[PDB]
Structure 1
Amino acid sequence: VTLCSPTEDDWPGMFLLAAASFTDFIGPESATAWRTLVPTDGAVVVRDGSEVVGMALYMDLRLTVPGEVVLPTAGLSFVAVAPTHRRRGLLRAMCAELHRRIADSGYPVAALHASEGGIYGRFGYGPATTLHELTVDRRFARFHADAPGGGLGGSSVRLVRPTEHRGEFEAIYERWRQQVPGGLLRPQVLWDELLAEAKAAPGGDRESFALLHPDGYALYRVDRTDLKLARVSELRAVTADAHCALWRALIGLDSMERISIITHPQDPLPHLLTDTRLARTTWRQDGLWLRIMNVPAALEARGYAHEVGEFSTVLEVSDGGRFALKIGDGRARCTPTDAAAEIEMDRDVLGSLYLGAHRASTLAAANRLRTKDSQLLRRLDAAFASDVPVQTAFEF
């Protein structure tokens, strides 16, 4: 069984594998558009001999991390092993080859969205963002006296067809992704794809609409089977006024009983309402997963909380080296050392800490990171925290 970069003749077989392997494959046309983000040598296949029995690739992405720093990021995707060739070491072989190519190419981090929670930790990936579904019974929803934008005049939100305001969505999203940890650059082809999904499909999803504000937008559609549920596919807002104004509009959808959205744990929505319980958490799950490819480059590139005072420690990553880590004035220096470790963790744990979604203290309580210094734990919690709460851009 051989492993190599696929040629053009391999792709019909790869699409076949994908169609049969994923729960709901996006299809050849969509995947070809996404493929424009895959660099030369960014893909591997495994052939039996000869049909394709395995595949995996990465895309070139730009990920925003705390301190508004943007890192080149390898986004793994299109990963499959044929049902006929399970438990043969094929995933391990493909991941190791891609990680070698990703490291040699100069990516400081790789990332992915996990199909199952138990597979990727052993390859050094830790979950780094958290998805929260909120479901609002809008029949009871009333805005608090303090909520922005409820004076006495015209409304700032418009209600439009998505495809006729492409430029404004692009510009709003671009501002959002640059300021939020977890943000991803969305190139033109992904806007093509997004707007194609906005149209209704015969025996499919219903037509999408948009609520448009100068500093934010929401895209929504009525659920296909529950016609009293509106699903917000995406809501991006760069000011509190825009966020509140958009939610006022959504709660104005008097045909609906419920509005649902996939958002993050620090979404201010529940505090916008007189009854905070009306914004029910109906689902919670890991979002973006991260593998730190180069520890010192990743740790030095990120900004850190100014509130914590300067401190130094020694960090060992289980098979990623040992480093003298000094954090102060919101910056880190991270240099090689053979001095005794004060903190130890597996590589995946560092990825889970990296964007601020998980506290070092909490990971210590599970013994996923080891130290005999509780003061150091407190300092790590505070330093790795993010002023702007971590969010999930889009699935890939």
Structure 2
Amino acid sequence: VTLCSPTEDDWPGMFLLAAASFTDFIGPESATAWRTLVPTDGAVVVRDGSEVVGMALYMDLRLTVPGEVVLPTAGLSFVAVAPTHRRRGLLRAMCAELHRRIADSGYPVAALHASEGGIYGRFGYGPATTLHELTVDRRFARFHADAPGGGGSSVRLVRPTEHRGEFEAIYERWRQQVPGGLLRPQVLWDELLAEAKAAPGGDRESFALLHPDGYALYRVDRTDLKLARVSELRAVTADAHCALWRALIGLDSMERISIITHPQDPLPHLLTDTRLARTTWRQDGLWLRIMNVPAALEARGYAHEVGEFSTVLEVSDGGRFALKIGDGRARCTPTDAAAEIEMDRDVLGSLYLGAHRASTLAAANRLRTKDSQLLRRLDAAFASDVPVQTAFEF
């Protein structure tokens, strides 16, 4: 049981473990595309005696954080232990080696999507963004008198494949402007438009709604032909967001439109009946591990409505820092002064993009302090002006 970087001969074995481990695995050509996003020495495999029984890698990603700041981010993915080698500490060993490499490469943060919610908190990952599924009963949906775009429509119904360039440009603007935003490279746009084709005995053809400042990708569900699934909706202005929803509610053959969006999606407020946009499903999105506390805390913007304050943050087994926050900027310096706020590294990941209130984590004792005032100040300071969203699964 050796742990090392895969050579070219190891990848066929990794694709086998992938096929066996991941129900969403497409195949080798698809996996070879994703592979272009893995840097030299971004992958570890565990071999036995030699077949691959363990793998983990990170991709080079660019994550937008509050203040429209873009951080280089280690995107953890393709993590699998062979079912024949469970409870053998192959995960702990592989995660430890990737975190060593990520830390030493100068990534301030690492991110992942969790297949399960009870395995990543112990490695320093906290849930940082929230997914909401909204299901609209569009037969009762009337737009409010106040809703924008209520002449002729600026939204066009188009073949996704013929307007790639327009989607790329709209997404590029979106991701630079929104916390949770990720740069989407060429190979992930190749994959998105591939998954947009009708598969024989699979998914149905996908259509696009195209606005100068927004797009929605949607398809009719395989089995329920009265449900339209919005796979992606990216709007840069409120005009674009409302116009795309007028078009989607205009799908008169459908009973229901479903979308995975965020808790602050304004759609419910566009309707005379907020309740018609039901929350069916709610889950953690992106998980963040802060690799370097001072680098991360200093890199993001803070609320400019919070008055300058100072405190001492202890991260368990992650350092103690004098934290000065003033006019949306933070300075974070080593100190041995008595801590005023204590928290595990994962709790910091959860606060970092403004998705979770410090008051809430405090109420669960994930975040300790004997000062209510400091709690309110952290809450306000760490809050994000632009609501935090999830870019894409990796």
- 1:353-388 per-position Cα deviation (integer Å, ceiling 9, x unaligned): 000000000000000000000000000000000000
- The alpha carbon displacement at 1:250 in A equals 0.3
Stretches of structure 1 that go unaligned for 5 or more consecutive residues are none
What's the TM-score, normalizing by structure 1? 0.99
Partner SS for 1:159: strand
- 1:308-367 per-position Cα deviation (integer Å, ceiling 9, x unaligned): 000000000001000000000100000000000000000000000000000000000000
CA distance in 1, matches of 2:200, 2:59: 32
Stretches of structure 2 that go unaligned for 5 or more consecutive residues are none
CA distance in 2, matches of 1:320, 1:116: 25
Correspondence for 1:97 = 97
- The alpha carbon displacement at 1:25 in A equals 1.6
Correspondence for 2:342 = 344
CA distance in 2, matches of 1:149, 1:86: 56
CA distance in 1, matches of 2:26, 2:181: 23
Correspondence for 2:137 = 137
Task: Determine if the alignment matches structure 1 residue 329 to structure 2 residue 327.
Answer: yes
- 1:73-118 per-position Cα deviation (integer Å, ceiling 9, x unaligned): 0000000000000000100000000000000000000000000000
Correspondence for 1:77 = 77
CA distance in 1, matches of 2:168, 2:22: 30
Residues 376-385 or 21-30, more deviating: 21-30
CA distance in 1, matches of 2:232, 2:17: 30
- 1:242-285 per-position Cα deviation (integer Å, ceiling 9, x unaligned): 00000000000001000000000000000000000000000000
- The alpha carbon displacement at 1:30 in A equals 1.1
- The alpha carbon displacement at 1:27 in A equals 2.0
- The alpha carbon displacement at 1:306 in A equals 0.2
CA distance in 1, matches of 2:351, 2:121: 14
Correspondence for 2:18 = 18
CA distance in 2, matches of 1:214, 1:166: 13
Partner SS for 1:179: coil
CA distance in 1, matches of 2:31, 2:324: 43
- The alpha carbon displacement at 1:26 in A equals 2.8
CA distance in 2, matches of 1:203, 1:264: 31
CA distance in 1, matches of 2:31, 2:131: 24
- 1:198-249 per-position Cα deviation (integer Å, ceiling 9, x unaligned): 1000000000000000000000000000000000000000000000000000
- 1:115-140 per-position Cα deviation (integer Å, ceiling 9, x unaligned): 00000000000000000000000000
CA distance in 2, matches of 1:100, 1:198: 38
CA distance in 2, matches of 1:379, 1:24: 43
What's the TM-score, normalizing by structure 2? 0.99
CA distance in 2, matches of 1:187, 1:21: 25
- The alpha carbon displacement at 1:142 in A equals 0.2
Aligned length: 394
CA distance in 1, matches of 2:130, 2:26: 24
CA distance in 2, matches of 1:115, 1:85: 18
- 1:155-183 per-position Cα deviation (integer Å, ceiling 9, x unaligned): 01000000100110000000000000000
Identity of aligned residues (%): 100
CA distance in 1, matches of 2:5, 2:171: 34
RMSD in angstroms over aligned alpha carbons? 0.6
Partner SS for 1:98: helix
Match of 2:291 among 290, 293, 306: 293
